[PDB]
Amino acid sequence: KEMPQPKTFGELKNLPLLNTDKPVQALMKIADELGEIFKFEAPGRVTRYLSSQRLIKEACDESRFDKNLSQALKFVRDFAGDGLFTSWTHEKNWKKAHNILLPSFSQQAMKGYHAMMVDIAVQLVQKWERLNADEHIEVPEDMTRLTLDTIGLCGFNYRFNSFYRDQPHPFITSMVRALDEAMNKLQRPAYDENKRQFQEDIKVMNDLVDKIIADRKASGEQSDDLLTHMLNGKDPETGEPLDDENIRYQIITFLIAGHETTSGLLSFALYFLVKNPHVLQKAAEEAARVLVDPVPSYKQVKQLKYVGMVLNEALRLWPTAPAFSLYAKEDTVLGGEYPLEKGDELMVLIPQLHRDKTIWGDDVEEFRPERFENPSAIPQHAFKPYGNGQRACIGQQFALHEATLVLGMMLKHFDFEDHTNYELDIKETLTLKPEGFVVKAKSKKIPL
Amino acid sequence: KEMPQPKTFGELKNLPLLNTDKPVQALMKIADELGEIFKFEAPGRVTRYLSSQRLIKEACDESRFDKNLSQALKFVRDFAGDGLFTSWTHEKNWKKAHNILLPSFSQQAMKGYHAMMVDIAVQLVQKWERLNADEHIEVPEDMTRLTLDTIGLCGFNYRFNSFYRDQPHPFITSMVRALDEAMNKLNKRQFQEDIKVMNDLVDKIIADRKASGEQSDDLLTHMLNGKDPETGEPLDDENIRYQIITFLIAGHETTSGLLSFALYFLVKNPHVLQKAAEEAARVLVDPVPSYKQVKQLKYVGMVLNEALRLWPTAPAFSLYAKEDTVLGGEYPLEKGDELMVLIPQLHRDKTIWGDDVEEFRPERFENPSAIPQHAFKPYGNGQRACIGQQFALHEATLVLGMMLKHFDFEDHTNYELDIKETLTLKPEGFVVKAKSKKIPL
Ligand code: HEM
Numbered sequence: 001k002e003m004p005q006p007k008t009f010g011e012l013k014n015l016p017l018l019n020t021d022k023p024v025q026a027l028m029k030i031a032d033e034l035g036e037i038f039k040f041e042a043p044g045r046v047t048r049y050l051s052s053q054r055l056i057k058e059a060c061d062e063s064r065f066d067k068n069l070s071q072a073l074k075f076v077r078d079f080a081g082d083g084l085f086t087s088w089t090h091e092k093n094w095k096k097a098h099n100i101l102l103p104s105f106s107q108q109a110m111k112g113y114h115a116m117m118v119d120i121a122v123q124l125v126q127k128w129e130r131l132n133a134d135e136h137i138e139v140p141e142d143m144t145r146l147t148l149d150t151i152g153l154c155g156f157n158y159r160f161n162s163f164y165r166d167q168p169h170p171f172i173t174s175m176v177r178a179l180d181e182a183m184n185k186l187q188r189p190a191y192d193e194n195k196r197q198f199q200e201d202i203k204v205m206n207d208l209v210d211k212i213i214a215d216r217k218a219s220g221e222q223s224d225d226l227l228t229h230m231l232n233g234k235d236p237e238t239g240e241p242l243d244d245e246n247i248r249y250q251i252i253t254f255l256i257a258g259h260e261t262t263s264g265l266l267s268f269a270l271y272f273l274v275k276n277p278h279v280l281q282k283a284a285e286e287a288a289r290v291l292v293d294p295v296p297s298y299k300q301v302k303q304l305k306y307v308g309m310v311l312n313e314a315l316r317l318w319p320t321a322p323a324f325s326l327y328a329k330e331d332t333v334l335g336g337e338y339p340l341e342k343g344d345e346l347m348v349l350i351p352q353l354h355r356d357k358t359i360w361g362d363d364v365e366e367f368r369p370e371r372f373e374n375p376s377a378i379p380q381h382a383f384k385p386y387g388n389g390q391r392a393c394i395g396q397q398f399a400l401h402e403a404t405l406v407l408g409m410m411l412k413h414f415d416f417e418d419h420t421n422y423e424l425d426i427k428e429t430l431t432l433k434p435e436g437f438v439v440k441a442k443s444k445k446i447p448l
Numbered sequence: 449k450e451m452p453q454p455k456t457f458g459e460l461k462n463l464p465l466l467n468t469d470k471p472v473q474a475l476m477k478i479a480d481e482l483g484e485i486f487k488f489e490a491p492g493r494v495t496r497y498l499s500s501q502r503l504i505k506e507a508c509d510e511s512r513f514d515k516n517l518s519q520a521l522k523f524v525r526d527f528a529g530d531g532l533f534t535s536w537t538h539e540k541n542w543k544k545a546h547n548i549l550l551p552s553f554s555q556q557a558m559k560g561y562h563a564m565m566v567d568i569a570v571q572l573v574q575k576w577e578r579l580n581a582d583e584h585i586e587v588p589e590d591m592t593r594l595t596l597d598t599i600g601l602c603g604f605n606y607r608f609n610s611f612y613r614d615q616p617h618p619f620i621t622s623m624v625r626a627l628d629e630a631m632n633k634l635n636k637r638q639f640q641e642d643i644k645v646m647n648d649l650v651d652k653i654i655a656d657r658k659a660s661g662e663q664s665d666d667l668l669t670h671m672l673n674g675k676d677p678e679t680g681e682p683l684d685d686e687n688i689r690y691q692i693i694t695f696l697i698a699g700h701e702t703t704s705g706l707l708s709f710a711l712y713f714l715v716k717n718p719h720v721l722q723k724a725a726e727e728a729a730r731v732l733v734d735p736v737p738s739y740k741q742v743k744q745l746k747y748v749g750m751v752l753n754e755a756l757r758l759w760p761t762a763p764a765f766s767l768y769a770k771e772d773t774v775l776g777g778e779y780p781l782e783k784g785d786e787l788m789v790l791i792p793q794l795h796r797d798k799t800i801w802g803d804d805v806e807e808f809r810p811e812r813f814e815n816p817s818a819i820p821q822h823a824f825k826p827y828g829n830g831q832r833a834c835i836g837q838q839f840a841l842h843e844a845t846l847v848l849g850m851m852l853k854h855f856d857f858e859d860h861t862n863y864e865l866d867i868k869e870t871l872t873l874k875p876e877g878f879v880v881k882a883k884s885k886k887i888p889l
Pocket residue numbers: 067084085098151253254255257258259261262265319320321324325385386387388390391392393394395396398399400
């Protein structure tokens with residue numbers, strides 16, 4: 001009946017126990033001590049962390065709880081606006097864009113993005129093929145170069161050309177700097193430069209995207225990107241199309257929501273494979289057997305089952321957008337024991353949910369892709385790396401198609417060496433990534 | 449591409465080869481002679497017996513094959529109904545009960561059953577402590593007393609009190625008579641009376657519990673309170689009765705057989721017995737073992753897996769092809785064709801275990817991640833694998849651990865292994881003498 005809660009230290013509340021830049025990892029250790037639910041207070045606020053499948057299945061009931069805009073999401077809203085990720089469910093533009101954009105994010109729609117994904121995936125393979133004998137790869141950096149360029153191309157037919165540069169395209173530099181500022185504001189005279197830079201980064205992002213939308217409207221061109229879809233879609237409900245300013249926010253939103261979650265997934269999967277050579281061999285044997293043409297077809301990506309299983313198991317251990325927030329829509333009782341008032345906040349701690357031993361067995365820290373061999377047998381709401389319900393990741397099929405395609409190509413074309421005996425270091429921002437992960441590849445010399 | 453087949457006898461097909469008291473052992477000799485796959489026919493039935501890890505790993509692919517209700521399970525369904533073990537995977541009650549019960553059979557859930565398991569284990573150890581100098585133990589008989597009573601207490605908080613009797617509680621007599629009758633069919637008046645004795649007792653305990661509202665640590669409390677996450681429905685009272693009967697039927701003899709074969713293998717290999725007893729002595733430092741202490745009995749757990757490797761006490765399971773498919777690139781099957789997995793022969797596959805397959809060497813399980821996927825399957829496969837696996841191992845680890853802490857054992861008759869076959873396997877007539885080390889219990 002009373003909710004477990006870590007030790008409080010006078011006016012500081014539980015704040016002294018989070019003196020870190022890795023709060024999710026610190027919170028998982030607190031969940032290991034106090035269990036499936038605990039309240040966490042700091043001078044400002046109060047939140048309740050949930051870790052078990054049994055309480056997370058209740059918090060996922062949409063007639064009772066809806067998505068909350070955390071303080072992180074409110075700061076990201078200054079440049080992401082009322083795009084799908086930083087909007088409340090009750091805003092008119094949330095529902096309109098949701099209805100309009102769902103059909104363009106389905107499994108079927110992936111058939112139309114496939115060729116543009118293969119385009120960027122071939123540039124990464126060629127980069128690694130062209131490395132001299134004494135070089136090495138910076139994994140998260142290269143994967144991020146790929147995901148930004150793929151989202152840029154599929155989203156609005158724009159080429160950032162990240163594999164041609166040491167310093168990213170100006171849009172990327174401003175987006176990433178705006179994101180970093182939004183997150184650094186969470187732990188905050190001498191910030192006047194931060195403020196002027198943040199306003200400059202917003203105008204760089206808006207001007208470019210507003211220009212491409214206007215350029216596209218003036219030409220009449222039709223293309224296979226999300227921008228065409230939004231220029232010609234109408235919400236079946238209200239009958240209206242999205243307006244130019246909201247399309248710009250969705251474009252920014254695809255990039256900020258998709259770039260590091262997907263690059264982090266590819267980097268953690270490759271980390272798990274080089275630390276588990278037998279798994280790597282089985283995944284590499286599948287890629288060799290399935291990817292028989294010079295470049296993969298859509299249908300061949302769909303048949304890389306074990307590669308998909310490695311990706312889901314990497315997402316089970318380190319889900320790359322690790323926590324999401326919800327509010328009680330009305331007074332209610334959680335799990336028969338914890339009363340909540342309307343407006344009370346809950347946080348879903350995904351990595352801990354994914355280590356619930358009543359679901360997965362006692363061996364939760366082992367990397368075992370075989371856990372996903374039969375997807376129909378994973379219990380309802382046990383695996384939630386893409387969030388929940390109508391507010392779940394609209395880009396889920398896009399992210400799995402992209403990662404399955406790329407990891408398959410990586411395993412086909414190269415052998416990998418963990419030449420530094422890399423020690424895992426998980427940096428936390430809006431997302432997770434294995435900071436400083438580095439490998440050497442040896443080409444299998446298979447022509448593209 | 450052509451599959452071997454043992455001798456046929458006209459319209460009797462291969463049936464007559466199974467007119468024996470030890471059919472799985474007859475099947476192993478046929479597997480020894482024909483290899484990794486053979487066809488076996490009866491009047492209007494066909495099945496293919498698999499023995500090699502290479503073919504059985506494909507058989508365990510759930511997108512291609514699902515559990516089949518063999519003739520034995522259809523006879524056990526007359527009293528086990530639509531409980532978990534005798535239901536098709538596509539029956540609504542199979543999924544309902546599975547979703548609800550899964551979390552109550554997890555390793556974590558064993559912490560809630562540990563105290564009642566200890567209650568019955570201590571009753572077994574005390575019986576042996578109280579034997580006089582001129583006495584011996586009947587192993588499988590005492591192990592079955594223990595597993596029936598533990599499943600009865602942990603499943604529905606009911607005491608059979610098998611250590612207070614020469615003749616078992618009446619439910620137990622009807623259940624073992626009913627199982628025997630279903631196995632002999634591969635009578636009718638007695639069979640119907642025995643079903644009724646089982647349903648009357650189990651239906652009464654369920655109606656008593658709902659009337660009182662008491663909440664206890666058993667499986668029945670879980671079933672009265674659970675709701676299937678998918679449909680939102682509870683199990684009804686009839687199905688709850690079938691699950692209780694099913695736990696008793698599926699768990700009692702497989703688990704007591706495992707305990708009997710482990711002790712047998714230990715008295716025949718004294719250096720392994722002494723290494724297991726030295727672990728028990730170092731870990732079980734309290735007069736009442738704790739849940740955490742049982743988990744530290746690693747070599748005892750390896751002795752039990754090695755006993756299950758040689759004589760897996762539920763030795764064969766049946767599968768059917770979901771769609772037309774080819775097995776191992778050589779054997780084309782049609783939708784509905786049946787496969788039988790011969791577990792003892794799988795566990796003797798020299799290409800996985802080495803040439804010393806007949807030797808008892810617990811050290812083979814030192815590194816559990818080194819055993820290839822589908823090489824070791826005493827609990828069946830996938831979503832239709834034994835839901836009781838954690839329960840069975842905690843129980844057996846707890847009990848063997850206690851045995852080795854408290855007694856020294858003598859194979860006083862120099863017992864000659866004789867494996868009796870029913871639904872399960874056991875070492876019939878296995879007897880030993882135990883001398884107490886006089887340690888507080
Ligand atoms: C493996 C990669 C990814 C992961 C783990 C991931 C995870 C998530 C999560 C957990 C949410 C819900 C956030 C919340 O409840 O506050 C979300 C929402 C969202 N994601 Fe993803 N994401 C990934 C890739 C992508 C990609 C590739 C795109 C787009 C190209 C994308 C676009 C979105 C959008 C637009 C939303 C908001 C949807 C709505 O509320 O209507 N994500 N994602």
